Design a protein around this ligand. Structure first.
Ligand SMILES: Cc1cc(-c2c(C)nn(C)c2C#N)ccc1-c1nnc(N(C)Cc2ccc3nccn3c2)o1
Ligand SMILES: [Cl-]
Ligand SMILES: [Cl-]
Ligand SMILES: [Cl-]
Ligand SMILES: [Cl-]
Length: 273
């Protein structure tokens, strides 16, 4: 029908021919796989600089392609533009799937925050700019939430900085970002994403501190159970702490929506001289 036809459209759009892609050096290589730089040859002739994320059976490949087809369809300046996917096969007969992304020379936001505290890195980031990062993330999440898409892994390390210093949310799905009900019931809503956004906001206000200093990951559920939350960063506005705090209300339904948060953030940013 319209649902199957709509899905089949998206599947055609999302796959890239392997010969239009040249893989380069490894930029990072964890347990999940590898991020590598690459060139993508475009419709208009010219090559584009890309990042290539390499991620085990035929069932999982379809699921991957279907999911990738949904993400390719996103279109917002504060949401990373998925350019397409390639599937290579290994010699051992294991299919290696590859996610093609625009190359982001300024990297992730977490590293950028930490670097800003080092002489050779980017100049001290003023609050006006820090707040603007939060607005950008809110905007991207607002978009995603409107389309009922759940990120499942919102954190400063998964927000990327474009060449114009615009922040986009990326790396779609770390105990300290997980909302209380998701630790408990293993259930995840947009209000769970809002919780993570609160934590992400706190990362930016602290210029990259790890959440909950003094609290081990295994201590996290009981810590939150007894009503403790992230503490107000020094020299952080009370109104800004009020906003981020509202993201961690015990009852998911008491937490604001991304659209409400985004608007609260913009007003606060306007008020700054
Ligand atoms: C968006 C995205 C989607 C998927 C994914 C998943 C989990 N399931 N399906 C089906 C897909 C698809 N398609 C996987 C990874 C990403 C992603 N987003 N950001 C990145 N990075 C590796 C960060 C990055 C980006 C750009 C960049 N340039 C230099 C360095 N850089 C670093 O990875
Ligand atoms: Cl992008
Ligand atoms: Cl860019
Ligand atoms: Cl730190
Ligand atoms: Cl804390």
């Amino acid at each position: 029908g319209s649902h199957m036809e709509e899905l089949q459209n998206k599947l055609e759009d999302v796959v890239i021919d392997r010969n239009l892609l040249i893989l380069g050096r490894i930029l990072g290589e964890g347990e999940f796989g590898s991020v590598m730089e690459g060139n993508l040859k475009q419709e208009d002739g010219t090559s584009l600089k890309v990042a290539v994320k390499t991620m085990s059976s035929q069932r999982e490949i379809e699921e991957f392609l279907s999911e990738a087809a949904c993400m390719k369809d996103f279109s917002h300046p504060n949401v990373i533009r998925l350019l397409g996917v390639c599937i290579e096969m290994s010699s051992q007969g294991i299919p290696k799937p590859m996610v093609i992304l625009p190359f982001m020379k300024y990297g992730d936001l977490h590293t950028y925050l930490l670097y800003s505290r080092l002489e050779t890195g980017p100049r001290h980031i003023p609050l006006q700019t820090l707040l603007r990062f939060m607005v950008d993330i809110a905007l991207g999440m607002e978009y995603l939430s409107n389309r009922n898409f759940l990120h499942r892994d919102l954190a400063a390390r998964n927000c990327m900085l474009r060449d114009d210093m615009t922040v986009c949310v990326a790396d779609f799905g770390p105990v300290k970002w997980i909302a209380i009900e998701s630790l408990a019931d293993r259930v995840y809503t947009s209000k769970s994403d809002v919780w993570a956004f609160g934590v992400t906001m706190w990362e930016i206000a602290t210029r990259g501190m790890t959440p909950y200093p003094g609290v081990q990951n295994h201590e996290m559920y009981d810590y939150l159970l007894h009503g403790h939350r992230l503490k107000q960063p020094e020299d952080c506005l009370d109104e800004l702490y009020e906003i981020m705090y509202s993201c961690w209300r015990t009852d998911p339904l008491d937490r604001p929506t991304f659209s409400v948060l985004r608007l609260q953030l913009e007003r606060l940013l306007e008020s700054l001289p």
